[PDB]
Design a protein around this ligand. Structure first.
Ligand SMILES: [Ca+2]
Ligand SMILES: [Ca+2]
Ligand SMILES: [Ca+2]
Ligand SMILES: [Ca+2]
Ligand SMILES: [Ca+2]
Ligand SMILES: [Ca+2]
Ligand SMILES: [Ca+2]
Ligand SMILES: [Ca+2]
Ligand SMILES: [Ca+2]
Ligand SMILES: [Ca+2]
Ligand SMILES: [Ca+2]
Ligand SMILES: [Ca+2]
Ligand SMILES: [K+]
Ligand SMILES: [K+]
Ligand SMILES: [K+]
Ligand SMILES: [K+]
Ligand SMILES: [K+]
Lengths: 360, 145, 360, 360, 360, 145, 145, 145
């Protein structure tokens, strides 16, 4: 022990630091949209504003950069706890020191306040570069699920050599409730791209290209219909429309397999259906075989009475009834073969149990 | 009455079952073919399918009595199998004779309703042994007229 | 006895109240299209015949609200009969008494006859709200299936712990005749969604947007072709065209899933094909192994005679006959391996039977 | 037997009558394409050559109606022979007497010579009704395949009870050579439809709508890549374009299924791959398990000499060599588990054979 | 021996000759695009620099025609080494002598210098015929892989009758890493086609139809969207657009199966999930079975005191607790049945091993 | 009170079980149906199932005691199975009696926290004749009333 | 040093293996868990993985020596297993000692080339027993330090 | 004539079969590889394959007589297997000798129609033993020289 009590604390201090860096990284993204849609619908009149917003964005970025490094220091503090070691100079590798720098560069791109309705060329990219802050979601999702500290769960995940990572939790969530997450992501991706493209192809002279003209263009491109009444006209608007088509094709590729798997009989329904479809065939065969002798005897009576116009009329009903009997016989034999072959995976246990009981 | 080519083709077909050139089919040679086709028969049905066609009875099948079998399974529908098998549904106990109970049950209750007196008269007319037990011979004779 | 003779009566009284509440809904829906297409093609001239249809579609709702409540009151009696109760105050839950209000609200939306070819905005939604009356179909289908009172059928559905609900009957119907229902629904939706859109985008001056221009836009949107000659021009016409594409994609997925299996051999034909493909390979190998020795002997004879121009020619055919023999024997070996590897389906049963026949 | 020698004659007389009614139908179909695209490019000038094609068509139709009835009269003889009958009045059913009438009605629709580049409305339907003569293809194909008279083949098709019909032969042909038939039908259906639509939407004023404009519309509609530059403008041209898309979707589904089935490893290569990957993993593990000791000893030496700047450097390589060892260990364990699980379709056979050999 | 040392030399001399014919066949293609885009953007002004490129693309063909014939002269010497021969007149077949001529004809099509920004019709096909030189890629790839001379890989591939050829290597590469090759080919086919079509539909008057108007047309045709703002206008540009859609459909068909296969639980995690679900189900059942007795006792107390308003309220909770208990036990039974049925592949092995250890 | 048609339908449903025709269901006739339905039960559970409904006790089930079974398994939810099965989770140690420790553990620790004094009072009130061991009869009496 | 909730959580985890409340984990119970997880081990491995953590040796595992096991299998990577598995690849004979030939083969031929004199010096330094046979204790001591 | 690298590579390939290290391959070491590759051979073929290449005869295969086997299985097509296997279709009695009837049937009836006199002359010419029974040695002598 000793190193087991200090692992339940340095890992809980990483659960309130990987979730509080998702609030200051959401507040920042929630202000660029406000600034853009206020500069568009406003202009140079609102000069007192459009400055406090940028100052708030800078403050939020500075408060996020002071949490990312704290989280990484806490993660470094776990290596020395796990592996018996005190000198911190060796617990720091040569790749983590570059991952930290990359994270700080990616999480530090904002339109700083260094000072009509158009954003520009530098701000229009420094704002759209704030959407890269979405890599913090899997970390917070993984650190919150209660499958990482449950001692009754790792004790079984270790006996089967199973490692707990993001993909395992993602697959578990997908298997629990598939349709909910699919619909949520599908309807949440049609509102972000519909603004990323609107900020790319908006114009003022024609008053066209805003959300009203993109919320219609994005879905028909996603579903690969493409009426062609509205089309992108800028080089930066022809790449989002190409990414959306690939996303739609991939979504269809995922959807087809799930749709195929969802509807199917299982063992219980199959066995019940097979058992209850046999009595109907057993009754139909008896009815068909009873519908043959009646005509075979009536024809004999009529040919002994020499009607010469009803014997030749009843000689067709016999020939049709024989065929009707044959069809039912073949269907019954096919169903019998299926039921005697479908139940062939559980009979092995019974056979080997009877053999073991015999012990001959 | 067949031509030379037909006889050669039927000999080639016989060679599938004969395997070794002894000239007859036994219960241990048809069973191998049936197992190769996926079925798993036993000796009882193996003998049942062989004594059906043996015109004299030796436990083996020869070419003259194989041509008789193959002159019936080549047509679109053989009218003898659905008379031999539309007879075992009238035979529930399995003794081999149609007693009054099975007939009076299946003919009247099921299918078109038939009068009991009419059923009795039909049974009496069909029966030729006089013992009140309709056999396969009388059944086939009545259905072939 | 006692509580079994009443379940056959209180449940048959729910079979004649689930179809007479569907006839009076079909009539109410059918006397709406007539009113709409008579107001459109007519006008203020037929102001006397539009005061009778709007009264019939209001009288045919008081004969539906008096049947829904009767059906819901015939089920509390079933609950009391089942769970040994006499006081009705306990058999009424807090959700059965809340869904009745929702049912009576949904089944009570009609263009009341409270007294210009365009329907007003207050009536164009009340009319299209009548289509919500289609939730009464699964109830009537289930209550009339005939597998709910069969004492020989529940006696086997209980030995396997199988519950009989709408999904089970739907799966049974789908498995019985798949294509019929698929084509029926596919061709029955293209006549309803081609009117729900023509009531939404019809125009007066241009005389465009009626059924003649919507029976062509809907199929090419369902199939995701989308030429682009005719496109919706209203916000309410751009939602139906989006709901149609998703249905088209789903129907395509179901079609792929159904068709993926129908083209495979049944187990009966595979064995016959394998057995009859082996004699051909044996004959081919026996013929090919005779096109080696003949040329070998002929080349030997020509070398003995020393033609020096035909020995070299016949040494070129031996090397190709050997290659052909190799190809034939490789194909035969592959087919033999496939035949001897498919026995795993049922050879285990035969070997177990043979071992049990001699274990004694 | 005497009834077996006649089945080889009455069925060979149906092989030269079901194939000679397929050439007098091809000739009939190939003489409307002339009477249409010579009336179009010609006119009233060639009024003498249009009175000969329309008479040759009638002669061919009369020679086809005299073969259909002969074929249908050569089958009543087979029915009488099989069942042992002499009175032909009983061998004729009530449905075969209507099938013949339907066949003679369908195969008797031609533009008779009962007497301006546009075909009349009452004549362009008689001309296009000739394409219904394509139901004679399966009949002429089934009778020609050598699986109907092979006494060595029905002998084995009767011990498994398989029936030889139009579907078994089609499945056999599909399995023997899938791709060539698929491409042939795909490219043969793009030339008949392109003429059926061209005869439907052609016009003279604009000189547009002929094969040059319908060989481009049909493929992009089939592939659902509808651009919108050329679109149908008539009610009869808007049904062919809807019929093409359904076949396109069905062919896409079939192609998806075929592609899914085609590409995969078989057992003979899977076993080789596993066996030759195990050796590589064994070598990699042994290579990796030496650096751990090498840097361990080197760090021990350096801390013995107390470098204080190389010991801390070599303590950083041991912790990575251990991880590299762990990765290879896990991969080798996973491959070993797969190998132990992949060989389970013949392991049971082998162990059961060993047990049977041990027994008795 | 003797002929084994010469097979490792005559086959290495075909590894530096099948790769050095891929450099002179790449230079001749790279100096074609330069000539085309220099004649287009240039004209008659650069009449001196166009007499050097067209001579280099003719000198670089004489160094490929002298390598193809050398490779085909080293293979005829492997034949004589394998099969003991001395006269080369018999080792040369009648089809290799035509394959060599076909190869020399295909690899000898260049715009020779036999002497206005448009390429002539006699050169626009000779240039585009250079792309047929891409059949040399599989030949160079196969001889470079280290599976053709590894004596440890052809000794386990000969005990199982496996031929290496070109398809086994392709399947191995596909299975080793599917995604990277798929994306590489997908993005490499969107740049060659975008030039093949641009050289086909370019025009000078409108300054349209170049790479900028094809890099947008090709992807939306590949993805089957087809907006319709830009469409081909020449017969040679309407065939490339038809060829692209077929490859798009084929790529989708390849993608759907891989997407379906990639995501799934393995055998290691299904057992862990099943083992960790039943504990939760047992806890839920034991918790739910305690909400029944509590209400059954509280209602008993309240009817003992005869509240007459709380007994009829506690009798409404027992009937719901029983239903919840039923749901929980049904779910637990279903999961237990799945667990007892899922473990049936190694269960048979375990049972048979136990029987062997017991009795043998 | 049952209509003749209902009696005929139940007699037809009985023929699915008494295939032999004697008129009673034994352990060897229900086992065949259970095996054909995919389940693999054995002697202990077969005997328990048969003894559950047998109102007299002979190892066999007759029509009058089969109508009683069918009068319970055709309703929407059986309220006796969920009281006979909500009793085996309280009885962890299989003996047929409820110990004080088992109840004091399941009722108090799990679900709503119940007072120990209240649990003891309920156990004393519903106990079997002062033995402190609640049986099935007392359980059913208390939970039905 | 643990709090009052981790003790309860680890007791709940222990109750998964100790199905009956005897208080110790035996070979049979662990084998049943292993089989329920889908694997099929046997007596040799079952006894091999139990004496690894048993600090005194009884054939059974207690709770104080279960906490020691759980203190290792919950960290990101166990470093006492990659020194016990990276030792059995240097011991091909299986006697339990590192022979001079085994080391001189694996260290020099594979990986980075090492001088024979350096390998001999390393073996002499690591051999605390002086018999020229490196054992697990000396190997672990040298590689941990 | 082999170089050092080729000899080393062949020695590495030898260790795939010779797992122990004694220096020879037995019928039980090749059987393990065959089973691991999915095949299920038995002692008959396991001895036949070894006897095919063993140039001295001891039941074991050595490296010098393994190089001889490997010199044939690395070329594109082995021309000895296709003459050894194109001989068992001319020998249906399984006695190792070519009967006159076998050749007169296979050569004349199938393939190109060959004259009976020519077939007899060929048989007489190839019958070096003079017993009228062509053997493997004469067959190989006729098909290669
Ligand atoms: Ca025989
Ligand atoms: Ca005989
Ligand atoms: Ca009888
Ligand atoms: Ca009985
Ligand atoms: Ca009884
Ligand atoms: Ca107890
Ligand atoms: Ca224990
Ligand atoms: Ca202990
Ligand atoms: Ca050693
Ligand atoms: Ca050895
Ligand atoms: Ca030897
Ligand atoms: Ca012989
Ligand atoms: K489009
Ligand atoms: K379009
Ligand atoms: K698809
Ligand atoms: K599309
Ligand atoms: K499209």
């Amino acid at each position: 022990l000793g190193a087991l009590r200090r692992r339940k604390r340095l890992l809980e201090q990483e659960k309130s630091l990987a979730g509080w860096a998702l609030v200051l990284a959401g507040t920042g993204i929630g202000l660029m949209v406000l600034h853009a849609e206020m500069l568009w619908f406003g202009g140079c009149s609102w000069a007192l504003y459009l400055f406090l917003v940028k100052c708030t964005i800078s403050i939020s970025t500075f408060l996020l950069l002071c949490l990312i490094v704290a989280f990484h220091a806490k993660e470094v503090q776990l290596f020395m706890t796990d592996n018996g070691l005190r000198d911190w100079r060796v617990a720091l590798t040569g790749r983590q020191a570059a991952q930290i720098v990359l994270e700080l560069v990616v999480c530090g791109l904002h339109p700083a306040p260094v000072r009509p309705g158009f954003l520009g060329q530098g701000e229009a990219l420094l704002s759209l570069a704030m959407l890269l802050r979405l890599y913090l979601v899997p970390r917070a999702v993984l650190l919150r699920s209660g499958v990482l500290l449950n001692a009754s769960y790792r004790s079984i995940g270790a006996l089967n050599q199973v490692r707990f990572r993001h993909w395992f939790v993602a697959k578990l969530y997908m298997n629990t409730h598939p349709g909910r997450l699919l619909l949520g992501l599908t309807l949440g991706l049609w509102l972000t791209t519909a603004w990323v493209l609107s900020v790319a192809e908006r114009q003022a002279v024609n008053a066209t290209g805003h959300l009203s003209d993109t919320l219609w263009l994005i879905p028909i491109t996603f579903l690969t219909i493409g009426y062609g009444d509205v089309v992108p006209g800028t080089m930066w608007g022809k790449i989002v429309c190409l990414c959306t088509g690939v996303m739609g094709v991939c979504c269809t590729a995922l959807l087809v397999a799930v749709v195929a798997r969802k509807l199917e009989f299982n063992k219980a329904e199959k066995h019940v259906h097979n058992f209850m479809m046999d009595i109907q065939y057993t009754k139909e065969m008896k009815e068909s075989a009873a519908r043959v002798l009646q005509e075979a005897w009536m024809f004999y009576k009529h040919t002994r009475r020499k009607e010469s116009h009803a014997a030749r009329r009843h000689q067709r009903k016999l020939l049709a009834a024989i065929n009707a009997f044959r069809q039912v016989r073949l269907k019954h034999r096919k169903l019998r073969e299926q039921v005697n072959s479908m139940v062939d995976i559980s009979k092995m246990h019974m056979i080997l149990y009877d053999l073991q009981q015999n012990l001959s | 009455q067949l031509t030379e080519e037909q006889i050669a083709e039927f000999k080639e077909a016989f060679s599938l079952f004969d395997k070794d050139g002894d000239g007859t089919i036994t219960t241990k040679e048809l069973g191998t073919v049936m197992r190769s086709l996926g079925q798993n028969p036993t000796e009882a049905e193996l003998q049942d399918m062989i004594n059906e066609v043996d015109a004299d009875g030796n436990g083996t099948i020869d070419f003259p009595e194989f041509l008789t079998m193959m002159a019936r399974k080549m047509k679109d529908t053989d009218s003898e199998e659905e008379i031999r098998e539309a007879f075992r549904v009238f035979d529930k106990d399995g003794n081999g004779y149609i007693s009054a109970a099975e007939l009076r049950h299946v003919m009247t209750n099921l299918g078109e309703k038939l009068t009991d007196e009419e059923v009795d008269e039909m049974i009496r007319e069909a029966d030729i042994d006089g013992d009140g037990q309709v056999n396969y011979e009388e059944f086939v004779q009545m259905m072939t007229a």
